[PDB]
């Protein structure tokens, strides 16, 4: 265990930030790690949603919740497309309670849009919740739009730190050997390329930029009563320590693990497209088994949870794979 | 006295039933008549059976089932009352069930009209209202009497 | 040409349709719903809301 | 009769409901595409494989 560490937790300014990270920890269960890597490529039939958390963003130490949804969005760009709406519902509290002014002009526009009109966007001027039930329809969560905003550039900024990484490839080693694909065209995400230079590693530098701009949001939140001023300073000893730990993983993360997905994209059985390189516009395009003589059976449906671990995706499986995990470090 | 329309030896009676029952006015039936399907789950729920009771008893049984099914309130509107009994800033994540768990609504009037009638008859009634209240504040650890 | 309600006539009828209930519809049970405490009591707002 | 096992063919099992069963009597089940509404579209010539 080494993600609340570095020594210097024997400082009575950390005590609050101490338990916040500790009560957000998971254990390195061998099977739980494998299930996260496998869910990234495997097709689904039940519309799974995240294990929801109730947390009113009170103090500067509550940034440890929004940062979790950042790291979950990178290592898994697909798998993030399905839950982009339910993760949005608990993200709006960070844009309302944390800083109140910018949300007032954003919700004035609306919380949901339709992608139709053969192009363009149709934002509905009303505030509504997500729920995850209306996932498979004509409703995209409007907080992930990208549309250049009128009077809250301040929010439309950090609302870009969820951007997809790597490239999308047309898998050929499956279509050349005639494996059955349920999509007309075989496609996938990668999802983060590999090393190109000698000692650069752009994936590690991209995260460094996130840490840089995400630090200013914490180093600006004007608080009062002093106890948050105590944790407002002792949070950078976690905000900067974590970014150094990251540059010690990225090499063995975007090389040995990158070639893993590259091959696994084109297996015998995998057939559907779970691509998510554009969170602004993407839908499942499901099929149905119907007879003209009164029969109806869909392929993907809302029912959940089933008596299997293939519903409710745990988002806490991020901290064990940054600390309590030795890679082959590249026999 | 219609299901025996072709099983009795008594000759005169047989021709008479197979005449007024065969009539273009009335008709006899037995068993499953129709089915009401589910919206989201897609399973059979409320089935109609052409049963063999009498009209006086069958009328009463239908008032109960209709009031149970037309309540429109799922067993999930139960956690909204279960939450009014804890710290103001707490919440729940409901195990969604929907139409598969219909629950009759909580009566607004019959209770307040009765808890008023009982209040006058038994004036000691407040005894177990100030008592249930005092058992709550004691269970929340607000005051502990140390010695000074 | 409609059906005359039989709940108001004299002569007693036998064998009417009764709205039953299949095994699916379960009533009066339990939900394993969980709680999440307000974590801190100091920053709770009853004042307005 | 032919060794082919059927652990749970034709029914869905939710953990907070139990075991609900569907019917298995389709006919000319032509797998076609659903529109966002739910209403059946058409063949989808030029797409769908």
């Amino acid at each position: 265990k080494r993600y609340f560490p570095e020594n210097l937790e024997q400082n009575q300014s950390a005590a609050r930030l101490v338990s916040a990270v500790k009560a957000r920890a998971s254990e390195a269960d061998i099977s739980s790690i494998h299930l996260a890597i496998a869910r990234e490529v495997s097709p689904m039939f039940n519309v799974h949603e995240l294990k929801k958390i109730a947390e009113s963003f009170e103090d500067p130490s509550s940034i440890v919740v929004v940062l979790e949804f950042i790291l979950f969005a990178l290592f898994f760009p697909t798998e993030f497309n399905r839950i982009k709406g339910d993760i949005q519902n608990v993200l709006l509290l960070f844009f309302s309670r944390w800083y109140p002014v910018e949300y007032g002009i954003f919700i004035q526009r609306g919380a949901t849009y339709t992608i139709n009109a053969a192009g363009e966007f149709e934002f509905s001027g009303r505030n509504e919740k997500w729920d995850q039930s209306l996932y498979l329809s004509e409703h995209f969560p409007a907080l992930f739009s990208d549309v250049p905003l009128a009077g809250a550039n301040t929010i439309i900024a950090i609302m870009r730190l969820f951007t997809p990484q790597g490239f999308l490839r047309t898998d050929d080693l499956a279509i050349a050997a005639n494996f059955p694909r349920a999509s007309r065209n075989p496609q996938t995400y990668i999802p983060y390329t590999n090393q190109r230079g000698t000692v650069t590693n752009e994936f590690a530098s991209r995260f460094r930029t996130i840490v840089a701009t995400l630090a200013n949001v914490v180093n600006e939140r004007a608080v009062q009563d002093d106890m948050q001023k105590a944790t407002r300073s002792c949070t950078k000893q976690w905000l900067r320590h974590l970014e150094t730990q990251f540059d010690n993983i990225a090499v063995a993360h975007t090389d040995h693990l990158s070639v893993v997905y590259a091959t696994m994209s084109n297996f015998m059985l995998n057939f559907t497209n779970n691509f998510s390189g554009n969170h602004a516009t993407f839908k499942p395009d499901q099929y149905v088994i119907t007879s003209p003589e009164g029969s109806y059976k869909p392929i993907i449906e809302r029912q959940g949870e089933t008596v299997d671990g293939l519903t409710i995706i745990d988002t806490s499986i991020v901290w064990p794979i940054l600390c309590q995990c030795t890679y082959p470090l590249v026999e | 006295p219609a299901l025996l329309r072709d099983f009795t030896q008594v000759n005169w009676l047989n021709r008479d039933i197979t005449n007024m029952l065969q009539q273009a006015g009335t008709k006899y039936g037995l068993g499953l008549t129709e089915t009401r399907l589910d919206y989201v789950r897609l399973v059979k729920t409320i089935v109609g059976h052409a049963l063999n009771i009498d009209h006086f008893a069958a009328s009463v049984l239908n008032i109960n089932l209709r009031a149970l099914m037309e309540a429109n309130v799922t067993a999930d509107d139960r956690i909204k009352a279960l939450q009014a009994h804890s710290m103001i800033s707490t919440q729940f994540h409901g195990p969604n069930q929907g139409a598969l768990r219909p629950e009759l609504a909580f009566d607004h009037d019959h209770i307040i009209r009765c808890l008023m009638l009982a209040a006058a008859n038994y004036p000691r009634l407040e005894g177990i209202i100030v008592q249930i209240n005092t058992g709550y504040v004691a269970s929340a650890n607000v005051i502990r009497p140390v010695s000074e | 040409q409609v059906g005359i309600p039989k709940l108001e006539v004299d002569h007693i009828s036998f064998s009417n349709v009764v709205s039953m209930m299949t095994a699916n519809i379960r009533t009066g049970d339990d939900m394993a719903v969980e709680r999440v405490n307000p974590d801190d009591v100091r920053a709770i707002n009853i004042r307005n809301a | 009769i032919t060794d082919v096992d059927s652990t749970d063919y034709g029914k869905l099992t939710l953990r907070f409901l139990g075991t609900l069963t569907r019917s298995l009597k389709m006919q000319n089940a032509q797998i076609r595409r659903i529109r966002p509404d739910g209403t059946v579209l058409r063949y989808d010539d030029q797409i769908d494989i």
Binding site: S26, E305, I313 | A75, H93 | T27, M31, V33, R35 | -
Partner: peptide, 16 residues
């Protein structure tokens, strides 16, 4: 220790 679990959680019991 905070162990990673997937599905919904079980605690108090509601009632008819």
């Amino acid at each position: 220790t905070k162990v990673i679990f997937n599905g919904l959680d079980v605690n108090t019991e509601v009632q008819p």
